[PDB]
Amino acid sequence: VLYNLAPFFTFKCYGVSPTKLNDLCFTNVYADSFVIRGDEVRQIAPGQTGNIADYNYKLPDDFTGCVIAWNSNKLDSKVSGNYNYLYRLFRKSNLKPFERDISTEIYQAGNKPCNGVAGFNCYFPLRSYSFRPTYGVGHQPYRVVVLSFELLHAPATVCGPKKSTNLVKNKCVNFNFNGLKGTGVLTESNKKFLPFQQFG
Amino acid sequence: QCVNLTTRTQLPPAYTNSFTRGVYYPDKVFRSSVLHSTQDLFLPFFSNVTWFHVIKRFDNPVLPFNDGVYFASIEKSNIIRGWIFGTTLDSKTQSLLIVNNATNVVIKVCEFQFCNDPFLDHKNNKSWMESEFRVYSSANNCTFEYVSQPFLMDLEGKQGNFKNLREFVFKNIDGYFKIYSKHTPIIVREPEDLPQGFSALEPLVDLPIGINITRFQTLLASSSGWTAGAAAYY
Amino acid sequence: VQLVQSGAEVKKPGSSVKVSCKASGGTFSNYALSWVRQAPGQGLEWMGGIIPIFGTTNYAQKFQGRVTITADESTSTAYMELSSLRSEDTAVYYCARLDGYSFGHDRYYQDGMDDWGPGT
Amino acid sequence: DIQMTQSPSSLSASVGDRVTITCRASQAIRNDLGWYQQKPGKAPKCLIYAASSLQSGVPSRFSGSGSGTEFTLTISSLQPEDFATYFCLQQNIYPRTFGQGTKV
Ligand SMILES: *[C@@H]1O[C@H](CO)[C@@H](O)[C@H](O)[C@H]1NC(C)=O
Ligand SMILES: *[C@@H]1O[C@H](CO)[C@@H](O)[C@H](O)[C@H]1NC(C)=O
Ligand SMILES: *[C@@H]1O[C@H](CO)[C@@H](O)[C@H](O)[C@H]1NC(C)=O
Ligand SMILES: *[C@@H]1O[C@H](CO)[C@@H](O)[C@H](O)[C@H]1NC(C)=O
Ligand SMILES: *[C@@H]1O[C@H](CO)[C@@H](O)[C@H](O)[C@H]1NC(C)=O
């Protein structure tokens, strides 16, 4: 599903090539939800610095995973103005990776703390988007879902599709049933296995 | 949040001779009329198992874990419902939860601040229900959840007629939590006397958890103030 | 949106000069109308930014109280009064829609400045 | 307010040269920097709203670079039609600094 559907415009990946992800099972995978403008797609990608890269989310320069974005001028774009989306552009320090800040404080520009209502030298860090379809390329919403790959000290449970071939009878083949390799022919048997075991 | 039930008397547990119980299939290999000498973590024949009984008597203490537990319950009220265990259970470690109450088998691998006195009992005199169950305070770092099909159980509780005999073994081998079970009915063995019969324990599921475990604890189901049926386990 | 400045006044000192910027189109607020002095012989410096809905009076150095910038209820025209006319303060006043926080429709932080006075 | 400097006015070059119009700063800010233009006797305009952001309505000759204490404007292909005076915007109070761009 990730490879096809050519409206998914972003296809370059940093850590591992996407066509080789069928093997090498990991512990668990993650999914996110990023709604950004056209210029902010490249800033999310590692190795680039932008207004969304240092004040909203700092992705590591090398990590196992990547992003895929698609044009959403017909889904996330409304003619009445899409005002729900918010982002932080006022951060005092730098950003560590892999955390969220849901602070609802005020940002000051002077040395003294401003506080209270907004105005001059006292700004809210959360600023609202607007995603009407009449705008050009660079402001259209591109939904970004980043995937996480990790190899923590647990047995792997997230995998890909498994390759199953046809059944060949009375012929000398090389069976690989559930990872058990061997050589011989396969015949119908009268044996009565219990359902609690797979090998004889 | 938990309520200190307390009013717990100090009755030491009994000792029982496990004659020939505690055997399981060590691997998923079918064999026809052969003899196999395996070297595996087993329960010895004619061993000293520790006996707990719940009637008036509240028996749910802390027991240490060492890479395999044979839990044998003979009961008909079916007050035994699950196993809550881990190492410290203070939201500083991974905690494991195996609960099968009515329709779900909940396997939880999470972060829990567990209470010093934890059970799924006691509400409205002795009316079995679903209240005072949230013995865990809150969940912060949950790493795994699993919901599985419930086993063959009973409804409410009754005293006597100890037909159901459940045998379980649990182990934590290289990360995998392996359980094996055998639920045999029609064992008419009400006056104690852990039976001298041979029946191997078959696997049910296998959980890819991947932690280490130090001690374990069972569970049973006005936090203090209920009358319970007759039940025994080893 | 387009800003149109009013005419100049008498050069002689001892009087107060009054200027006004009319913002035709785009009845919007919380974008501070920044006033700045342009001259071929001197540099530019911030004189002040007027907000219709808030009306704060944050100013720069060396002309605190010599200048008063006010406006109407929403957008419209913005008035600026300067007293104590002198010889070194002569320039042209430019009002601009500077980017910043907006508490109105909440659509663009960077709307785009395309408005400038004719120059009086 | 705290003072800062800008590029000298003696930047003369022919058609197709790179200019190094430098704005020196004193505080670590990114979006608050800007480059504006003022033609002598004509209507003013902007050049860049920040170092990493542009405007709609400019040719691609005007470019900005740098993110430290200096910010550099560069023209890819210099033309006589770019005869204007360029000024730099910093900080919250906006202390602006002198500037003069003429090719001679
Ligand atoms: C019993 O009370 C003590 C202190 O009053 C408290 O720390 C403890 O958690 C309580 N036990 C339960 C099971 O609530
Ligand atoms: C083990 O069990 C026997 C009877 O089955 C008992 O006599 C003996 O005391 C037990 N061992 C210990 C250490 O209590
Ligand atoms: C078991 O858990 C599932 C999980 O959502 C829940 O829907 C169901 O009602 C539970 N069964 C009970 C409480 O009997
Ligand atoms: C025990 O609880 C049930 C639940 O409603 C109630 O009907 C019964 O009267 C209670 N027993 C006593 C002795 O009050
Ligand atoms: C949850 O526990 C795992 C186990 O080590 C740990 O790696 C992870 O960082 C924990 N989660 C958080 C948010 O700290």
Residue numbers in the entry:
A (entry chain D): 369 to 568
B (entry chain C): 14 to 68, 77 to 242, 256 to 268
C (entry chain I): 2 to 121
D (entry chain K): 1 to 104
Published text:
To delineate the structural basis for broad neutralization mediated by these NAbs, we determined the structures of a prefusion stabilized Omicron S trimer in complex with the Fab fragments of the three NAbs by cryo-electron microscopy (cryo-EM).
Unlike structural studies of the apo SARS-CoV-2 Omicron S trimer with a major configuration corresponding to one ‘up’ RBD and the other two RBDs in ‘down’ states, the XGv051-Omicron S complex structure revealed the S trimer adopting only one conformational state with all three RBDs in the ‘up’ state. In the structures of the Omicron S trimer bound with the other two antibodies, the S is observed assuming a configuration with two ‘up’ RBD and one ‘down’ RBD. Antibody XGv051 binds to an epitope at the epical tip of RBD, largely overlapping with the patch targeted by ACE2. Structural comparisons revealed that XGv051 is very similar to S2K146, an ultrapotent and broadly reactive NAb effective against all circulating SARS-CoV-2 variants, presumably cross neutralizing other sarbecoviruses through ACE2 molecular mimicry.
